[PDB]
Amino acid sequence: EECMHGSGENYDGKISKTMSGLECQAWDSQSPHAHGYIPSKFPNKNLKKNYCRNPDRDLRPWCFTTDPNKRWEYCDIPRC
Amino acid sequence: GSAGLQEKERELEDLKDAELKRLNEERHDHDKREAERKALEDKLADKQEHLDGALRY
């Protein structure tokens, strides 16, 4: 689905940009922001490439930004 | 297991229990940290200077 119904826990779209317009950092990458959201650690969260996901049960899907001045930001994904 | 149901359940309920257990207690402090850090930048910029410096929150 390229849209979300609720919080976006089941969102497996190809959107890889935050609401700020920044390209999300790869979940399999520790650059430029280091994290513990390892795709192999959470395989049931469908962490692929740098697509916006909701693996922590947040309000809206998010991702790490490409800006070292901002750890992470929420993504802008349309609702169904 | 014997029926292979365990491999089907994949301990999804077990993982979900940890989700609410953690509740992003760590990430919460991280966000709050960056919040004041960003504000510090404005204080260094001095656009208005509405901080006497006596209390400093």
Automatic annotation (TrEMBL), chain B:
Residues 17-32 form the Plasminogen ligand VEK-30 domain. The keyword Secreted applies. Keywords: Cell wall, Peptidoglycan-anchor, Secreted. GO terms for cellular component: extracellular region. The keyword Secreted applies. It comes from the Bacteria. Residues 6-57 have a biased composition (Basic and acidic residues). It is found in: Secreted, Cell wall. Belongs to the M protein family. This is M protein. The chain holds residues 54 to 108 of 275 of the full protein.
